[PDB]
Amino acid sequence: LSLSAGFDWTASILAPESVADFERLLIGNPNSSVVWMNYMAFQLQLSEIEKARELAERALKTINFREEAEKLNIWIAMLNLENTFGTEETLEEVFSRACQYMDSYTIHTKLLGIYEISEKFDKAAELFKATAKKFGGEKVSIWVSWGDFLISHNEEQEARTILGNALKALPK
Amino acid sequence: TSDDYVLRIFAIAFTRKQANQVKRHSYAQSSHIRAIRKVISEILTKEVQGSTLAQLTSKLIPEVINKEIENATKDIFPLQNIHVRKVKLLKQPKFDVGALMALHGEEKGKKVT
Amino acid sequence: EDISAMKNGFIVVPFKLPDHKALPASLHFMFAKRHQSSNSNESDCLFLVNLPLLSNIEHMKKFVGQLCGKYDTVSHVEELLYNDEFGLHEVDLSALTSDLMSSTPRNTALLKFVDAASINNCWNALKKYSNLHAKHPNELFEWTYTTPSFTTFVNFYKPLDIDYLKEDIHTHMAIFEQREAQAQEDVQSSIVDEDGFTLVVGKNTKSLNSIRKKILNKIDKKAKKDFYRFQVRERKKQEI
Amino acid sequence: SNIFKLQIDELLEQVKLKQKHVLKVEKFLHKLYDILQEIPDWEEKSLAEVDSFFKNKIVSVPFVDPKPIPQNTNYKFNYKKPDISLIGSFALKAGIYQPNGSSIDTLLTMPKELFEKKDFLNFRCLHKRSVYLAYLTHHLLILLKKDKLDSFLQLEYSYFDNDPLLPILRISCSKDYNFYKTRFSINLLIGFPYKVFEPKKLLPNRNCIRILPATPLYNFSVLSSSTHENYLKYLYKTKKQTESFVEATVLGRLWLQQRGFSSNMSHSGSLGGFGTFEFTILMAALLNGGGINSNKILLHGFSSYQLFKGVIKYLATMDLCHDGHLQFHSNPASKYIDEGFQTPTLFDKSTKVNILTKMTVSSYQILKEYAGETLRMLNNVVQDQFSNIFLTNISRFDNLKYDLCYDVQLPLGNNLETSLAATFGSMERVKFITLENFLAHKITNVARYALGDRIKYIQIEMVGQKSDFPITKRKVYSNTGGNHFNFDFVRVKLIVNPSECDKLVTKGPAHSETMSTEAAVFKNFWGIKSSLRRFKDGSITHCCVWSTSSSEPIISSIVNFALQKHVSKKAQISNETIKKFHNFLPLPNLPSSAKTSVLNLSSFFNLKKSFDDLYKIIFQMKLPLSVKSILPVGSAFRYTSLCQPVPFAYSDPDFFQDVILEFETSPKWPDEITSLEKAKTAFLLKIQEELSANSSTYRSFFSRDESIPYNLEIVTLNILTPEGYGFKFRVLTERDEILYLRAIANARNELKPELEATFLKFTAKYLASVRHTRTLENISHSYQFYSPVVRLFKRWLDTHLLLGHITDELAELIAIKPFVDPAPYFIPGSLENGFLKVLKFISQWNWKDDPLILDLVKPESERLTLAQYKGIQMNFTNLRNSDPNGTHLQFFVASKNDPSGILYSSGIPLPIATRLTALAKVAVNLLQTHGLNQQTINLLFTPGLKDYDFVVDLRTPIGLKSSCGILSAPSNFPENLNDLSEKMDPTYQLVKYLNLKYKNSLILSSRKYIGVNGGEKGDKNVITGLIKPLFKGAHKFRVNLDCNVKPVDDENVILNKEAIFHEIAAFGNDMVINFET
């Protein structure tokens, strides 16, 4: 005969609805942003913003560095998290950090969307100006999206001024 | 040392004049002498702690330590006759025959009849 | 087997596997999509996924040759870009530590062609190749897996040629002397900006890249509480 | 201290007995007392009359051997109502909850009129006692039947404290008066009145069995039988005086149980004799004095810890057996006498009773060791020791508790051989009442003398000794005994002394003109094997010379001959378990390999001597930069290589040994890394070049090393020493470290975790490695057995395909803890004791929540201080905060060398880490289920291999065992050094290379040392793989799947097992033979 021991990949030898269940899922699903995000939301639904913040920090490191798309889910999730439940400063800290790790212009675009969804038009306009300043000379989409924002809010004259600025900044 | 040999070391060096020197003397003002003694203290401490007594004497024979001193002190001021003058062994640990045998690299007797 | 192409647009590319005594019609599939990029070196490339083990260039030279003969198409290949199947070269550490000597997914690589005439020829041929499995699996091609690279790779415990090493070290050194020498002159050459501002460079500084990295990396004690008539007036205020 | 306070209370409440079971028992035995008073009296009877009275009764008198015969039993027998009383811990209300159960001691005092003043002679009183007990049982049973309680009571006889001279009745409840749930047993102790016999006549020196030799044991029993309530009164006063009497007492009780100490007799063989009572009596004796100047040692205001701590100090340092003894007065301050009686003695002048009679000298020595051993733990402030002191049972396994165990099978075992029975004889029945007492002394006395300084402590245990017998029988009946001897066999348990265990010659008395008494006993004890020999010093002494064997220790040989010569020529002594471990260690292919002892490190030193010759050559060589130092950092250089070095045995994976070369500091090192090593390689070219010219007898070549990730240009010089030994040379540069520090700084934040991992291997390989070898080699001298056990430990990992993922250092740091941290056990002194201790730890270790921190120091500076200790402790919490499940890091091994704690334990997959714990848990459970034996061990070193998803068989073209230097062979290096690869095993590189490909999908494992675990020829290796849960199931396809898969739908794929099976097959080429999926 021989020694045979059942394989243990969850360290047991030592839908999700609890703190454990998501962790047991994360044993086999470290690269799934959906599983991480689902355990982001459960903590938030429990009013545990602090335990939610430390979580995505683990998610940012746990996920393989090559899974850029999965990483994008967390960064957008944090932007939604800080925008909804946090303050201006923490959102800025995440926002600056998000641009540091990922394509900055993409991160700018997502926050513009987040502000529009959250109906924070004043901050959306300000971030449009900053995003256009940094990327206006290279990206036509920011000008089109910014023009879409103003036309949606019945600002035709501002759109014309913005289009003029688009021609000045963009290459011929 | 990490084998718990507490020792005291004494290092001696001398000032030297440059190749193009014209001044008769090669005195150094005190703030070198204070910065010299500091780096000498650091290197001597680093070597002894980072070496066993058997390993330590292995460094003494080639006089490597003087050379790191000479390189370490080269920026601050040129020196000469850098030497570890004297080495004392203040305290010893509990004696271990097994370690001693290893450092030196049992026998049955002969019937008397 | 009826599957010919995947919905997002990666086409199936089946292969017959070698016969080995240990393992007595098992197949290997690669997945390919036309790669589009404005970058010149990435232009005219075919994106490829799930490559066989140690799939360097001359493998595809056989397969493209097999496809060319079967489908009477003219297709030719320069090189397989981004073939890092071990993930050995993903970080260019030489570039990371310094700028001198280096100005600079997984299980996939980019297959470059000679011209647009070749890639479309192959891409059309590769479709007809894909449809083969549904009808005639036997006529599929077989992945040889053997090309002179594997003998070098399989021979792990091969000493390096000392003569080759000596020449290489000399060449890499000598170029380094030229580059470092040029850098040290550049920093200590009295750089002055167009508006008459003279850069400050310290002694023993070797690289301007060193200077910029330092910049990125990086009154109250002298103030007195009690000197001015206003100050003691504040003190007189708090005293009572 | 306050932490210890609260921990003590938690232990107290946890073991506190539930008061309901108390009230349950007083309901019963109070009624039992009513039953006793119903028992009628009796008239004077002779032995003939009582025999007839008991002839037909089911009950039989438990008469003690020698049973009374009609001639010598002239004294009559009578029964009268005794004085019912309750004694023991329950009397003092100091009991605790015991899952196995506790006992309630009820004392029955015999009316004084039932005795004569001279009834303490020739067992006169004890025979009177035996019939009295029988008469009680006869009447108690019928009354028990009358009251209907017999349905759930079972009655049997037993010996108090395993004392054959003191039979007693035990009452237990089987499944309103039913007290089965209470887990208690009422013990009916038949004691004598106080002062029936003159205690002066019952002193240990005096005799009371006519045949003159003294009778300490028999004197103890009768006098102790007459002194029970007196001590109860003595304890009761002290309990009132000091508030914490009970709390200290239970602490002593709990400690005694964990160390397997009991009040039961020790001359009978079992470790014990010291129980709660003796601990309480000593503590009481310390609570009325104790010092040489009769000064107080414990104060009534002390807390439980102070009372417990003082006692542990008291026993640990003062000797009560050989030099010094204590006297106290139960009824006067206790004073420590310098004189000793050569036996553990606690004299009581008030009662003239030595409480330590039941202690054996051998047991006392071990007991003193434990007290001192715990005391250093008690004084410890850096680490908490509460659990180890109180919450760890070391008596579960004898092998873990004893270095060597020998089972001796006595001949003719339905009575012992006539010669053996003859040895017992008249003088010893008076001295040792029972042969099992006498024989145990005989085994101990010969064993202790023969072994002498080779051992520290010795324990003789008679396995299978019973103490309870049915009422229908007079004495205990053993299956092999046949009422003659109450044991199955005797086991000799030893605590060996590593320093002198393997001495080839046992030194003896020096020669003289007239043979001294010591010389005479030396010659007589050893007989023929005694010899007088001269040594190189010129001394002449009587000594006997042994032969070392790689398969057994000298301790085996000595005990066989000594026991056989003196005990019985027919005795069979066998310890196969140690033999098998010895065999599993690889036998080197060196001269006289078999005759070497496993403590011989001879092969290892030869490697250094060859290195030293090479060392000198390098230094005298002239290079542009002077050599700062050459540091060897190899496994062999730290005496941990699994297989001993062998000349020219280059098939061994560890044959090539690493060494660090450091030059003098210079500012001309290249500032770009890729130049830096190419500058380093340039130096090696000089070393290879000039070495070749000046020293042609040394051969050399270069190799490609990729251990450091992404540093693909570090080139190492391989030197083949003419002695037949190989070394790998690699240059360290002070700029190298900061360049890596440069890399992490400017690296992109996402990439920074990757680079620091590269730096982690860099420091692990160059910087920390030097410190690791330096500390380990020094400590290894003190820990003689550490070097082989870590090798065997590594051997065990290899069989289960675990070394490939476990770095050798981590195994070494794992294997050493029983040595640096033996608590609660002792330092391992046997290969068996050490290895199982390593496995025992790993099974019970909670890596998820418990860190591992080692003081790599010699036995009692560099000890971890409180500041450093906490400093490491926060590190574990911070890491576990980020990694609670422990996925990224598993084993947290830290020390002075590694304060980070992550150096040698990073990169190991979780499945592997759980296996390491899983395998140990199965291992210990197997040991518990089945005792250590040839079958169980052969299981411990065989791999199951079934659980793996797919298993691949590989075979090498030639047998590599001989070229590995393993004796079931090359004598020079090949002329063409390319030929070396022809005699190597590539699989360990194959699996590593295959692991990196399929990291996201597969975990492959293989046996690193094919020569050791590759069969007889050492040519078979196996590659075992493991699929993650994710790619086991089908997945929607994606670019970032990063795996070889087979489509099933137009957006679904599954793992391609078969192609993977092909690729490994061609990758092994002719090596692969078979697959198993």
What is the rounded (10 degree) CA torsion for C164, C166, C168, C169? 160
Task: Find chain B residues with C-beta within 8 A of D504's C-beta.
Answer: 106, 108
How many C-beta neighbours within 10 Å does residue D397 have?
A: 18
Instruction: Tell me if D611 sits within 8 A of D773, measured CB to CB.
Output: no
For residue D302, give how far its alpha carbon lies from the nearest alpha carbon of chain A (Å): 41
Question: ω before D859 within 30° of 0 (cis)?
Answer: no
* Cβ separation B110–D533 shorter than 8 A: yes
C34, β-bridge pairs? C46
Nearest C-alpha in B relative to D637:
B102
Among candidate residues B80, B92, B84, the one with its CA nearest the CA of residue B26: B80
- How far apart CA D131 and CA D116 sit, in angstroms, is 16
DSSP D660: E
Residues 6 or more apart whose Cβ sits within 8 Å of residue D203:
D219, D352
DSSP B85: E
D974 at C interface, C-beta within 8 A: no
D922 at C interface, C-beta within 8 A: no
User: Which residue from D688, D1046, D1065 is facing C23, i.e. has the nearest CB?
Assistant: D1065
For residue D476, give how far its alpha carbon lies from the nearest alpha carbon of chain A (Å): 40
Among candidate residues A100, A157, A153, A165, the one with its CA nearest the CA of residue A125: A153
User: Which residue from B105, B107, B112 is facing D532, i.e. has the nearest CB?
Assistant: B112
Tell me, rounded to whole angstroms, the distance of Cα D877 from its chain centroid. 31
Instruction: Tell me if A40 sits within 8 A of A49, measured CB to CB.
Output: no
Q: How far is CA A147 from CA A123, A124, A132, A152, A162, in A?
A: 16, 12, 11, 8, 7
Which residues 322-351 of chain D have a CB within 8 Å of chain C? none
Residues 6 or more apart whose Cβ sits within 8 Å of residue A103:
none
Among candidate residues D617, D639, D633, the one with its CA nearest the CA of residue D722: D617
- How far apart CA C71 and CA C74 sit, in angstroms, is 9
Amino acid D366 reads I
- How far apart CA D700 and CA D729 sit, in angstroms, is 10
Among candidate residues D640, D644, D437, D456, the one with its CA nearest the CA of residue D555: D456
Instruction: Tell me if A140 sits within 8 A of A146, measured CB to CB.
Output: no
For residue D207, give how far its alpha carbon lies from the nearest alpha carbon of chain A (Å): 59
Q: What are all long-range contacts of D210-214, with beta carbons under 8 Å and residues at least 24 apart?
A: D210/D121, D210/D122, D211/D426, D211/D427, D211/D429, D211/D430, D212/D430, D213/D427, D213/D430, D213/D431, D214/D431
* Cβ separation D545–B109 shorter than 8 A: yes
Task: Find chain D residues with C-beta within 8 A of A67's C-beta.
Answer: 1040
* Cβ separation D939–A3 shorter than 8 A: yes
- How far apart CA D396 and CA D394 sit, in angstroms, is 6
- How far apart CA A53 and CA D526 sit, in angstroms, is 78
Burial class (CB in 10 A: 0-12, 13-18, 19+), C221: exposed
- How far apart CA D394 and CA D374 sit, in angstroms, is 13
3-class secondary structure for D73-118?
Answer: CCCCECCCCCEEEEECHHHHCCCCCCCCCEEEEEEEECCHHHCCCC
What is the rounded (10 degree) CA torsion for A97, A99, A103, A104? 180
Q: What three-state secondary structure class fits D325?
A: strand
Whether D1-16+192-201+242-397 and D946-1077 share one fold: the answer is: no
Residues 6 or more apart whose Cβ sits within 8 Å of residue D745:
C217
Residues 6 or more apart whose Cβ sits within 8 Å of residue A93:
none
Residues 6 or more apart whose Cβ sits within 8 Å of residue D614:
D698, D719, D721, D727
* Cβ separation D543–B71 shorter than 8 A: no
Encoding tokens for residue D88? 């023991």
Termini Cα distance of chain C = 96
Chains in contact with chain D (at least 3 beta-carbon pairs closer than 8 A) = A, B, C
Encoding tokens for residue D371? 């007290």
- How far apart CA D79 and CA D82 sit, in angstroms, is 9
- For every residue of chain C, DSSP letters joined together read ----B-TTSPEEEEEEPPP-SS----EEEEEEEEE--SSTTTTTEEEEESPPTT--HHHHHHHHHHHHHHTT----EEEEET--SS--SSS-HHHHH-STT-----SEEEEEES-HHHHHHHHHHHHHHHHHHHH-GGG--B-----THHHHHH--S-PPPHHHHHHHHHHHHHHHHHHHHHHHHHHTS--B-TTSPBPP--TT---HHHHHHHHHH--TTT--SS-SHHHHHHHHHHH-
Backbone angles phi, psi at D430, to 5 degrees: -70, -40
The experimental method is: cryo-EM
- D–C touching, 3+ CB–CB pairs within 8 Å: yes
- How far apart CA D734 and CA D49 sit, in angstroms, is 101
- How far apart CA D718 and CA D704 sit, in angstroms, is 10
Q: How far is CA D274 from CA C15, D166, D260, D301, D845, in A?
A: 79, 18, 10, 26, 32
For chain B, give the residues followed by a break (C–N over 2.5 Å): 105
* Cβ separation D923–A66 shorter than 8 A: no
Instruction: Tell me if D640 sits within 8 A of D790, measured CB to CB.
Output: yes
Amino acid D349 reads K
Amino acid C200 reads V
- How far apart CA D59 and CA D131 sit, in angstroms, is 11
* Cβ separation D940–A28 shorter than 8 A: no
- How far apart CA D698 and CA D250 sit, in angstroms, is 70
D188, β-bridge pairs? D106, D169
Nearest C-alpha in D relative to A66:
D1040
- How far apart CA D150 and CA D173 sit, in angstroms, is 10
Task: Find chain A residues with C-beta within 8 A of D944's C-beta.
Answer: 2-5
Termini Cα distance of chain A = 80
DSSP D977: G
Domain residue limits, chain D: 1-16+192-201+242-397, 17-191+225-241, 398-504+548-574, 575-945, 946-1077
How many C-beta neighbours within 10 Å does residue D705 have?
A: 16
Q: Are strands D102-109 and D184-191 parallel, antiparallel or unpaired?
A: parallel
Q: What three-state secondary structure class fits D489?
A: strand
Nearest C-alpha in D relative to C15:
D1059
Write out the H or E segment, with its range, that includes residue B54. helix B53-60
For residue D688, give how far its alpha carbon lies from the nearest alpha carbon of chain C (Å): 10
* Cβ separation B2–D775 shorter than 8 A: yes
Which residues 55-74 of chain A have a CB within 8 Å of chain D? 57-58, 61-62, 64-67, 69
Q: Which domains does chain C have, with CATH numbers?
A: 1-114 (no CATH), 115-174 (6.10.250.2760)
Task: Find chain D residues with C-beta within 8 A of A101's C-beta.
Answer: 748-750
- How far apart CA D484 and CA D439 sit, in angstroms, is 13
Q: How far is CA D123 from CA D127, D191, D207, D621, D948, in A?
A: 6, 15, 12, 90, 70
Q: How far is CA D450 from CA A160, D361, D402, D515, in A?
A: 109, 17, 19, 20
Which residues 195-214 of chain C have a CB within 8 Å of chain D? 206-207, 213
Would residue D92 be called left, alpha or beta, if left means φ above 0 and alpha means ψ between -120 and 50 degrees? alpha
Q: Are strands D346-348 and D325-328 parallel, antiparallel or unpaired?
A: parallel
DSSP D596: S
Among candidate residues D798, D1070, D773, the one with its CA nearest the CA of residue D919: D798
Encoding tokens for residue A132? 């256009």
Among candidate residues D401, D324, D340, the one with its CA nearest the CA of residue D366: D401
- The CA-CA-CA angle for residues A148, A151, A157, to 5°, reads 125
* Cβ separation D1062–C20 shorter than 8 A: yes
Among candidate residues D655, D649, D682, D689, the one with its CA nearest the CA of residue D668: D682
Instruction: Tell me if D656 sits within 8 A of D627, measured CB to CB.
Output: no
What is the rounded (10 degree) CA torsion for D769, D772, D775, D777? -80
Write out the H or E segment, with its range, that includes residue D896. none
- How far apart CA D557 and CA D548 sit, in angstroms, is 9
For residue D861, give how far its alpha carbon lies from the nearest alpha carbon of chain B (Å): 6
How many C-beta neighbours within 10 Å does residue D196 have?
A: 21
Instruction: Tell me if B92 sits within 8 A of D777, measured CB to CB.
Output: no
User: Which residue from D682, D711, D746 is facing C213, i.e. has the nearest CB?
Assistant: D746
Q: How far is CA C28 from CA A102, D215, D1032, in A?
A: 35, 90, 18
* Cβ separation B112–D533 shorter than 8 A: yes
* Cβ separation A3–D882 shorter than 8 A: no
Among candidate residues D942, D834, D936, the one with its CA nearest the CA of residue D576: D936
A7 at D interface, C-beta within 8 A: yes
Would residue D290 be called left, alpha or beta, if left means φ above 0 and alpha means ψ between -120 and 50 degrees? left
Burial class (CB in 10 A: 0-12, 13-18, 19+), D698: middle
Q: Nominal resolution in Å?
A: 4.7
- How far apart CA D780 and CA D777 sit, in angstroms, is 5
Instruction: Tell me if A39 sits within 8 A of A55, measured CB to CB.
Output: yes
* Cβ separation D749–A6 shorter than 8 A: no
The string over C185-213, giving b where at least 16 C-beta atoms fall within 10 Å of a residue's C-beta and e elsewhere, is eebeeeeeeeeeeeeebeeeebbbeeeee
Alpha-carbon radius of gyration of chain A: 21
* Cβ separation D754–C159 shorter than 8 A: no
D1035 at A interface, C-beta within 8 A: no
Would residue C193 be called left, alpha or beta, if left means φ above 0 and alpha means ψ between -120 and 50 degrees? beta
- For every residue of D1053-1069, DSSP letters joined together read EEE-HHHHHHHHHHHHG
CATH architecture of D946-1077: 2-Layer Sandwich (3.30)
* Cβ separation A5–D944 shorter than 8 A: yes
Nearest C-alpha in D relative to B111:
D533
Write out the H or E segment, with its range, that includes residue B8. strand B6-15
Among candidate residues C34, C68, C28, the one with its CA nearest the CA of residue C48: C34
Burial class (CB in 10 A: 0-12, 13-18, 19+), D360: buried
- How far apart CA C111 and CA C42 sit, in angstroms, is 9
Encoding tokens for residue B105? 């690299």
- How far apart CA D719 and CA D149 sit, in angstroms, is 88
CATH architecture of D1-16+192-201+242-397: Orthogonal Bundle (1.10)
Burial class (CB in 10 A: 0-12, 13-18, 19+), D301: exposed
Q: What three-state secondary structure class fits D541?
A: strand
**Selected residue of B60, B108, B111, B113 to mutate for chain D interface (largest D Cβ count, 10 A):** B108
How many C-beta neighbours within 10 Å does residue A141 have?
A: 11
What is the torsional sign of CA D608, D611, D617, D619?
negative
* Cβ separation D782–B96 shorter than 8 A: yes
- For every residue of D351-419, DSSP letters joined together read TT--TTTT--HHHHHHHHHHHHHHHHHHH--SS--HHHHHS--S-S-HHHH-SEEEEEE-TT-----HH
Q: What three-state secondary structure class fits D725?
A: coil
**Selected residue of A1, A2, A3, A102 to mutate for chain D interface (largest D Cβ count, 10 A):** A3
For residue B24, give how far its alpha carbon lies from the nearest alpha carbon of chain D (Å): 31
Topology of the domain covering D398-504+548-574? Alpha-Beta Plaits (3.30.70)
Residues 6 or more apart whose Cβ sits within 8 Å of residue D524:
D530
- How far apart CA D135 and CA D156 sit, in angstroms, is 14
- How far apart CA D306 and CA D378 sit, in angstroms, is 11
What is the torsional sign of CA D933, D934, D935, D938?
positive
User: Which residue from D627, D665, D782 is facing B68, i.e. has the nearest CB?
Assistant: D665
Question: ω before D653 within 30° of 0 (cis)?
Answer: no
B4 at D interface, C-beta within 8 A: yes
Please report the beta strands in D910-1029, taking only residues with DSSP state E, as ranges in sequence order. 950-955, 1005-1006, 1020-1025
- How far apart CA D411 and CA D420 sit, in angstroms, is 9
Residues 6 or more apart whose Cβ sits within 8 Å of residue D1069:
C154
* Cβ separation D664–B68 shorter than 8 A: yes
Q: Are strands C27-35 and D544-545 parallel, antiparallel or unpaired?
A: unpaired
Q: What three-state secondary structure class fits A82?
A: helix
Amino acid A38 reads N
How many C-beta neighbours within 10 Å does residue D1030 have?
A: 17
- How far apart CA D193 and CA D196 sit, in angstroms, is 6
Q: Are strands C27-35 and C45-49 parallel, antiparallel or unpaired?
A: antiparallel
- How far apart CA D276 and CA D256 sit, in angstroms, is 8
- How far apart CA D614 and CA D624 sit, in angstroms, is 19
Task: Find chain A residues with C-beta within 8 A of D939's C-beta.
Answer: 1-3
Q: Are strands D540-542 and D544-545 parallel, antiparallel or unpaired?
A: unpaired
Which residues 652-711 of chain D have a CB within 8 Å of chain C? 670-675, 678-679, 681-682, 685, 688, 701-704, 710-711
Among candidate residues D642, D641, D647, the one with its CA nearest the CA of residue D606: D647
User: Could you tell me how many CB contacts below 8 A there are between chain A and chain D?
Assistant: 91
User: Which residue from D540, D626, D774 is facing B67, i.e. has the nearest CB?
Assistant: D626
* Cβ separation C91–D754 shorter than 8 A: yes
Instruction: Tell me if D402 sits within 8 A of D469, measured CB to CB.
Output: no
User: Which residue from D678, D1063, D1066 is facing C169, i.e. has the nearest CB?
Assistant: D678
